[PDB]
Amino acid sequence: SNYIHIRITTVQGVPEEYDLKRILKVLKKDFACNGNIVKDPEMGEIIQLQGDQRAKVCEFMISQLGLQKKNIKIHGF
Amino acid sequence: GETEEEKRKREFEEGGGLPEQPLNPDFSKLNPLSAEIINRQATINIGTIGHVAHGKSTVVRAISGVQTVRFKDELERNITIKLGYANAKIYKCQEPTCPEPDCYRSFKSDKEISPKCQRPGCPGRYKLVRHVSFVDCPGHDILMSTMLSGAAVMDAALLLIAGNESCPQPQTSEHLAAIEIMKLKHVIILQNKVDLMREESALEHQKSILKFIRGTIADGAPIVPISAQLKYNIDAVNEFIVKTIPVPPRDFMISPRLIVIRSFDVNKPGAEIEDLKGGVAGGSILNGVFKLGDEIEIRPGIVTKDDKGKIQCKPIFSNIVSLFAEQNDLKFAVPGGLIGVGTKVDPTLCRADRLVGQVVGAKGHLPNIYTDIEINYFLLRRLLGVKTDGQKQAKVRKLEPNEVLMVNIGSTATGARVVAVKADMARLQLTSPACTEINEKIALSRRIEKHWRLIGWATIKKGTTLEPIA
Amino acid sequence: VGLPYSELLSRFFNILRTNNPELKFRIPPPVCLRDGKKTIFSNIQDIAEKLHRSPEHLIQYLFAELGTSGSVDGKRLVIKGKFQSKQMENVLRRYILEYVTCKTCKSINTELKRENRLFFMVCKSCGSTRSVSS
RNA sequence: AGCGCCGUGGCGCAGUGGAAGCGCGCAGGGCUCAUAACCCUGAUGUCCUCGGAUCGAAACCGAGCGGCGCUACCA
Ligand SMILES: Nc1nc2c(ncn2[C@@H]2O[C@H](COP(=O)(O)OP(=O)(O)CP(=O)(O)O)[C@@H](O)[C@H]2O)c(=O)[nH]1
Ligand SMILES: [Mg+2]
Ligand SMILES: [Zn+2]
């Protein structure tokens, strides 16, 4: 399992080996985009990203934490 | 228009069914090959050894048909900690016309004493040459104590080697060395993979295996190609088991004992507790005959710590309510077979891993629990189970004082502290209770690369007794 | 003595050559019809007999993967919308990798039985017993 | 094998007791020069198959299904 995906933008599905606020700090600078760490009523992790930059967050988890890069699915939307 | 179950029932009744064990038969005449012993209980234990990600439970399942569970969700796939059990019956065709290689036929536990032959054209039936028990042992680099215990229980060996991987795999060498440690030479080498291979790759692998076994203890060990998925060439393995492996000396003279390796509780959930069952200790009897309704005590038993740090041992007396062997409840037990003693021992004492390697003695014997033991140790040169990337497979160093080392005395898995070091002898201090009855075969492992690693063999010479608290 | 070893190995090779002259590929190209607004797959039962699966389980999975639950007719599944044909080729290949073909061995005849409450995956060449139902 | 949950409108969440729910989606329309933002309107269901008490059940109860999660392989 451990399904990770990006939906037009938001990233839902995040393993927590690294801190989520640290995730905000390593996203916000490079991406220059607004990001909201919102706790939905008991779904996976929610992190926002304004403007469609799905390939950019692909590059991002490539840089920071991505280790499988096969279950991450680029949604159409 | 008979249903398949009806046809099987007709074949079962035609085959004589399965006669019940006598309540009180003459034991001075009973042999492991007697008809009454052989029909409903196994007399020889056969264990399988191999490297990880090869498949041993598959071969055992193909030989017999008894499934090996592979439980605990996470362990359903990777590796199992508890041993695997499977009952197989050696059935040989009585008709001379049919070829010898396919005469033998291994069946499962509840088959009749004489099933019909499945080869087309032979109206003959099968005769029960032997009932064999199978003790699947783990072959991972982490789980050794269970494998050493089951190999101590083991009396006959089946080594599994697959061809397409590296010829000198270390795990099989380690298991063969362990078997060589504990007085066991009847080893049958089996090729796991033959189908996906070329006719010369198999020959090269066979040459490699022959080169491997030239200087070890076992010399005339046969090699047999087998399949775990296609389910062929199983009768040949049965024939080799019949021919190569005789009955180890096991008569009724020696005193009764029990070596429990698995603890099983019988508490079916959802059912009201009004109708329950006693707790089951899964133990091997290598010496003695056990009968229904006997008084028995677990020797190491209740381990407790006093407020002063002293270790108190309370032997666990209990009455035997049942002795489950093979498929049906039986009246008497045969040494050389893994039997579940279902006694009135509290079910929580048989919950998960409490009676894993514990000695148990029937009322009428006085084993000895020891705190400090004297051991005679003999070492090996190169550590087995390690793939060194081109530089001198690790040389075993001499032991040092005060090191926690795993001293698997038969089935007991304990970490002992060394108090004395010399050329051959060592004093082992045991924080966990261990007991000695006659000799006990022992394996030694150290912690050099994280997980436990075998170094050599050991034999108890003396010990400091702890008198039971009644 | 390794003399009784080579005979059994040659017998095994002869048994292989008897059973498998080719050394699975009995998976037909999917045929989906696009009637403008209605997508019809009349190949579900043919692949049911070409994969040895229970058609009810095939249909329940094919509903559980998308946001659709069409109609069963006869040997065919009916849905009313705009959809492609490559999608179910990929679906079939993944489903083959997970259920139709056992990961451990190359065989199709393997199928789903119930030994608890869930579905247990079992084989037909050997009889491997795992829990593959999600 | 039992026990603690679930039965979608594409999805998340709700009351289940007089009869389709809110929001996220989607489409369409309004705003604006225009876009975004904002505002209005829709169409997506046996809220899982079968019965009971009941003028009435999506629920109140079950005689079971399909999937979850705890025990732990439950000779
Ligand atoms: N191709 C092929 N696959 C086999 C063969 N035997 C077993 N397998 C594969 O091995 C798998 C079962 O492995 P398993 O017996 O659980 O491994 P294991 O015995 O637990 C490894 P360990 O003893 O170290 O714990 C099956 O899924 C099967 O596909 C064989 O002869 N050929
Ligand atoms: Mg196992
Ligand atoms: Zn298979």
PDB file of C-alpha atoms (C1' of nucleotides) in Angstrom, chain D residues 3-64:
ATOM      1  C1'   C D   3     -15.638  -9.397  18.773  1.00  0.00           C
ATOM      2  C1'   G D   4     -15.369  -3.511  17.704  1.00  0.00           C
ATOM      3  C1'   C D   5     -16.758  -0.296  12.471  1.00  0.00           C
ATOM      4  C1'   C D   6     -18.491   0.681   7.632  1.00  0.00           C
ATOM      5  C1'   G D   7     -22.640  -0.148   3.080  1.00  0.00           C
ATOM      6  C1'   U D   8     -22.513   7.116  -1.246  1.00  0.00           C
ATOM      7  C1'   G D   9     -23.970  11.806  -5.190  1.00  0.00           C
ATOM      8  C1'   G D  10     -16.820  11.151  -8.253  1.00  0.00           C
ATOM      9  C1'   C D  11     -15.283  11.682  -3.310  1.00  0.00           C
ATOM     10  C1'   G D  12     -15.084  13.159   2.246  1.00  0.00           C
ATOM     11  C1'   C D  13     -19.062  13.968   6.350  1.00  0.00           C
ATOM     12  C1'   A D  14     -24.225  13.229   8.432  1.00  0.00           C
ATOM     13  C1'   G D  15     -28.699  12.576  10.747  1.00  0.00           C
ATOM     14  C1'   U D  16     -30.999   8.238  10.623  1.00  0.00           C
ATOM     15  C1'   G D  17     -36.730   7.365  12.645  1.00  0.00           C
ATOM     16  C1'   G D  18     -42.678  11.788   8.103  1.00  0.00           C
ATOM     17  C1'   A D  19     -38.734  10.327   3.054  1.00  0.00           C
ATOM     18  C1'   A D  20     -32.572  12.309  -0.178  1.00  0.00           C
ATOM     19  C1'   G D  21     -28.608  14.297   2.816  1.00  0.00           C
ATOM     20  C1'   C D  22     -24.017  19.013   3.663  1.00  0.00           C
ATOM     21  C1'   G D  23     -19.390  20.091   1.625  1.00  0.00           C
ATOM     22  C1'   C D  24     -15.420  18.855  -1.631  1.00  0.00           C
ATOM     23  C1'   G D  25     -15.833  17.740  -7.056  1.00  0.00           C
ATOM     24  C1'   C D  26     -18.518  18.418 -12.309  1.00  0.00           C
ATOM     25  C1'   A D  27     -21.472  21.435 -15.553  1.00  0.00           C
ATOM     26  C1'   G D  28     -24.091  25.767 -16.479  1.00  0.00           C
ATOM     27  C1'   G D  29     -25.283  30.838 -15.352  1.00  0.00           C
ATOM     28  C1'   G D  30     -24.462  35.578 -12.799  1.00  0.00           C
ATOM     29  C1'   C D  31     -20.177  39.399 -11.436  1.00  0.00           C
ATOM     30  C1'   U D  32     -16.029  42.038 -14.050  1.00  0.00           C
ATOM     31  C1'   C D  33     -13.344  45.074 -19.881  1.00  0.00           C
ATOM     32  C1'   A D  34     -11.704  40.387 -18.796  1.00  0.00           C
ATOM     33  C1'   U D  35      -9.571  36.642 -15.533  1.00  0.00           C
ATOM     34  C1'   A D  36      -9.056  35.095 -10.863  1.00  0.00           C
ATOM     35  C1'   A D  37     -12.076  35.769  -6.271  1.00  0.00           C
ATOM     36  C1'   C D  38     -16.996  36.071  -5.144  1.00  0.00           C
ATOM     37  C1'   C D  39     -22.460  34.850  -5.974  1.00  0.00           C
ATOM     38  C1'   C D  40     -26.778  31.483  -8.030  1.00  0.00           C
ATOM     39  C1'   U D  41     -28.670  26.688 -10.368  1.00  0.00           C
ATOM     40  C1'   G D  42     -28.500  21.913 -11.401  1.00  0.00           C
ATOM     41  C1'   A D  43     -27.631  16.043 -12.375  1.00  0.00           C
ATOM     42  C1'   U D  44     -25.143  12.172 -10.381  1.00  0.00           C
ATOM     43  C1'   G D  45     -28.269   7.045  -5.182  1.00  0.00           C
ATOM     44  C1'   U D  46     -31.434  -0.109  -4.533  1.00  0.00           C
ATOM     45  C1'   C D  47     -27.126   5.259   1.432  1.00  0.00           C
ATOM     46  C1'   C D  48     -25.104  -3.588   0.991  1.00  0.00           C
ATOM     47  C1'   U D  49     -29.311  -8.228  -0.695  1.00  0.00           C
ATOM     48  C1'   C D  50     -33.472 -10.345   2.403  1.00  0.00           C
ATOM     49  C1'   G D  51     -37.622  -9.838   6.518  1.00  0.00           C
ATOM     50  C1'   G D  52     -40.079  -8.138  11.171  1.00  0.00           C
ATOM     51  C1'   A D  53     -43.054  -4.438  14.965  1.00  0.00           C
ATOM     52  C1'   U D  54     -44.969  -0.069  12.618  1.00  0.00           C
ATOM     53  C1'   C D  55     -50.594   4.550   8.448  1.00  0.00           C
ATOM     54  C1'   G D  56     -44.864   4.614   7.089  1.00  0.00           C
ATOM     55  C1'   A D  57     -38.592   2.852   7.309  1.00  0.00           C
ATOM     56  C1'   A D  58     -32.267   4.687   4.696  1.00  0.00           C
ATOM     57  C1'   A D  59     -32.766   4.062  10.329  1.00  0.00           C
ATOM     58  C1'   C D  60     -35.396   0.429  15.573  1.00  0.00           C
ATOM     59  C1'   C D  61     -34.371  -5.462  15.421  1.00  0.00           C
ATOM     60  C1'   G D  62     -32.604  -9.688  12.992  1.00  0.00           C
ATOM     61  C1'   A D  63     -30.731 -14.019   9.121  1.00  0.00           C
ATOM     62  C1'   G D  64     -26.774 -12.603   6.073  1.00  0.00           C
TER      63        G D  64
END
